[PDB]
Amino acid sequence: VDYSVWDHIEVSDDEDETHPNIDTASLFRWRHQARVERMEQFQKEKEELDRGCRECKRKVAECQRKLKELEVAEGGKAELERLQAEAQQLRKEERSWEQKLEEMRKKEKSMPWNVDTLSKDGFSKSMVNTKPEKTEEDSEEVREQKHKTFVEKYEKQIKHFGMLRRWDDSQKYLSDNVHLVCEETANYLVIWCIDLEVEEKCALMEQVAHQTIVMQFILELAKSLKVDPRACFRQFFTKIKTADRQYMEGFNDELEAFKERVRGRAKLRIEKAMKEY
Amino acid sequence: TAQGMDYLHAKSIIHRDLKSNNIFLHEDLTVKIGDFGGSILWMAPEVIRMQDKNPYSFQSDVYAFGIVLYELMTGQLPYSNINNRDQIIFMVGRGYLSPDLSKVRSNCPKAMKRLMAECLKKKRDERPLFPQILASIELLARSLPKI
Amino acid sequence: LDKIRYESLTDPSKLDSGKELKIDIIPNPQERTLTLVDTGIGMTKADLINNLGTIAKSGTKAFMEALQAGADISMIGQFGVGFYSAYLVAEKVVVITKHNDDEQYAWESSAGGSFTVRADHGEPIGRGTKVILHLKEDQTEYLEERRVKEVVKKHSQFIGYPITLYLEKEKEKYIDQEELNKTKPIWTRNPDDITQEEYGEFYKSLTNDWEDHLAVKHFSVEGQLEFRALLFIPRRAPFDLFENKKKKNNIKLYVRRVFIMDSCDELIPEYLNFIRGVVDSEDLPLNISREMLQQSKILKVIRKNIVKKCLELFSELAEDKENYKKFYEAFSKNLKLGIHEDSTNRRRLSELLRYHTSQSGDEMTSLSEYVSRMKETQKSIYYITGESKEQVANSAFVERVRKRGFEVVYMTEPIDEYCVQQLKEFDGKSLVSVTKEGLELPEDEEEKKKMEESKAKFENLCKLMKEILDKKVEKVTISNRLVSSPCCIVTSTYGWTANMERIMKAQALRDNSTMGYMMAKKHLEINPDHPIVETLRQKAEADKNDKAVKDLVVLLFETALLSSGFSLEDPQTHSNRIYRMIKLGLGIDE
Ligand SMILES: Nc1ncnc2c1ncn2[C@@H]1O[C@H](COP(=O)(O)OP(=O)(O)OP(=O)(O)O)[C@@H](O)[C@H]1O
């Protein structure tokens, strides 16, 4: 294990380190412009030394050719001595450029890192997803075809669950439902509860009142809200799960309002009972 | 403002300008240093020096801070009667002037007067380094509330 | 599992003891046991004794180094002390092991100073290993199903292997729930092979939804630090986007497909909160506690890249004018906030704004496209800020700059002031509003002389009117914004403006000492065209001063105060003045 490589990462634009008496934006500007002018200065220096090295190498090739052609020839002892002195001097400044080259090469590892050095792009790809239309809805036919399957696939499950009102089970089952259920069989199940009220099932009747009041509230809130009810349950769940004594008593008085509505629906029920039967 | 600029320069940071418009007086009395557009034409002839293309140094910043704070205490502009940029720069070439001494406040504090007088004697290169200036500021401040 | 999988792709005939791969969980609240059988590679007695019985060493590193130098696998685990964290909540563990070429063995310890191994006979295991535990008495809470499901969802659900559950609920069945992980990762394989629909599918399984997204970006980057992105954009603006409080978990972060941490006060700026995604990578300087990343500068480098390569998508999507309508109506708050607080990328963001102008009845107009059609002599764009669309649609100031065929825009929203306050330029131009210290527009020469004649002829009425009005207004002049109304009110450059005068009062948590200083001084503007102002002149040179002039001037001034959206402090004073004449309307007061 060695983290000595991940220890000199710096940015031109840090936020946590700042001063109470300094402008943050102008400080970003100063840091970035300093960092870029510094890279460009070191750049200029590095192509300067690179072209110095290139001309040094071309002169090395030239002097190698000169030495070869002097070896081919003979009798130029003075010229040979002069070019030997020149070659020794060239070798001396060659160690000069070499020691500074190795110094800068070594200090390259000491240079702090940055984003444009660590990263090189390899891929990218976008998309839009503007698929044609969502739906167009009639008023007559769809009310049956999806309705029947919504009835059989959920009436028994809602009968099974509706026997309880404990909060987290109710919340998660209703989350499943609003992920999957619709409205027609919801209302129609409510009216089955209404016409089954005869058995006087007190806990069942309270939970029936709860489910019908929440579905009615969700539907009116969604309609005035112009949003799909199936995606409108979270704020209700967080409001009713932390419903305190005042909020529960508001629920109780609105339930009393629903209770005179219960008396009204029962009266119309009994009247239709005599009329039909 | 001295504490702020000391902190900024503590990271080897140059400013290249601190023109008196670059200050925002925020809530209460708090300085925010600006960059975008008293000593806007009063810098040292170091600017006019165009040799080796790097005359920039901390000395110009120190002198500019000194003159700017002195004028800000003073409250009015030096050199507003005679204005000839070409003739001013020619006179800078030879026959450069000296600051006027009559233009001084009556209640100039002794420590600050001594510091500003001592700043520039022969060369604008042996200026002191920031935190002892800060110490002089703090001692003069916490040495004359009333007692 | 991965070890044996890679080993298999050398000689597939060696797997003649079991032909599949699976992971299983066995709770048992009778002897209080937590059997955790898997089907990994196995272990031999010698490696067991000389490797497991020693603190702080990984055999994985030695095995990986033994495997050539450079291969094709990305494995996890390099520290070694991971099994010794199993005693945090435990009292006694036993490991049951067997290798294909070894015998059955069991290892036992109880956090003491010694351990035991022993050969055993019983149920035959093919190649897997068992870990069995005795749970503490005080922590008998992790055994039920809901906590286990919650924790497995939270931490590790992306391993592409079948972890399964065998609980027992109500003739009674053996629950074989396999769906613990059934949403394989999508940023791994070749990006081209994916067929659209799972981009719609994966987003739903990401956060519990039944809608679809609006865009996607899937870039990946190599080099030294390597990672991949799976950013999305939601179709519907959440009601609770600003509810905060609950810890923010919009953007996650994985290292080798294992959850580490999540936070978006360093990964992305606050005004881009609505974006989700996966930022998986390969290797980072992690902690011994495998949740924190030391050397926190990395979490600052990643931010630059993420914002840079999201802004490109944002700029690109400005082509289709249909989708841009539904996007701009929903998340405009984010861009309008972001333009306020950012410095590196401001000019680039100065074109994604759409406004309503006075040439487009019910269509938004781009300001960049606005740069096309202006007149030649004109300088700088003209704009107004109001409280309501219709309220500003027909304003008294406009009635002069509208007759000349120019073009203006309406920024009528509280944040619009915040945006327009900071930005002051667009492509060499300036942004100036109508109510800033008497703007003037270049125009024909002959109007100059008559206007200055009104200046030089109406000096006395302008002189004597300031006496009767005490120190409320600064100056009254004749300018060019009035053709159908006598009077109006305009602010000053160094000071506040009318609409933010109400954004500040309406702001809840603020001091009450700030009003003293930066209230903007006020300016009144008169129109020497309405006959009322001329009718004032005859009584001005006729009567030096009396009650009637005071009454009329205070009435007109107080009415003018309402004209610019200012709210009076004593409505009874003006209500009495309006009721004073309706009684003359029917005649006899008394
Ligand atoms: N299920 C297992 N089957 C066989 N050998 C195992 C098993 N788990 C651990 N070992 C062995 O015992 C060692 C204990 O190390 P452990 O796996 O707990 O840590 P690690 O993977 O190196 O680190 P970390 O848990 O931080 O990723 C392993 O390196 C491996 O040699």
Numbering used by the authors:
A (entry chain C): 2 to 278
B (entry chain K): 560 to 596, 615 to 724
C (entry chain B): 51 to 220, 273 to 692
Sentences from the study reporting this entry:
Activation of client protein kinases by the HSP90 molecular chaperone system is affected by phosphorylation at multiple sites on HSP90, the kinase-specific co-chaperone CDC37, and the kinase client itself. Removal of regulatory phosphorylation from client kinases and their release from the HSP90-CDC37 system depends on the Ser/Thr phosphatase PP5, which associates with HSP90 via its N-terminal TPR domain. Recruitment of kinases to the HSP90 system is mediated by CDC373, which functions as an adaptor able to interact independently with HSP90 and protein kinases and facilitate their association. We have determined the cryoEM structure of an HSP90–CDC37–BRAFV600E complex, and structures of HSP90–CDC37–BRAFV600E with PP5 bound in phosphatase-engaged and phosphatase-autoinhibited conformations.
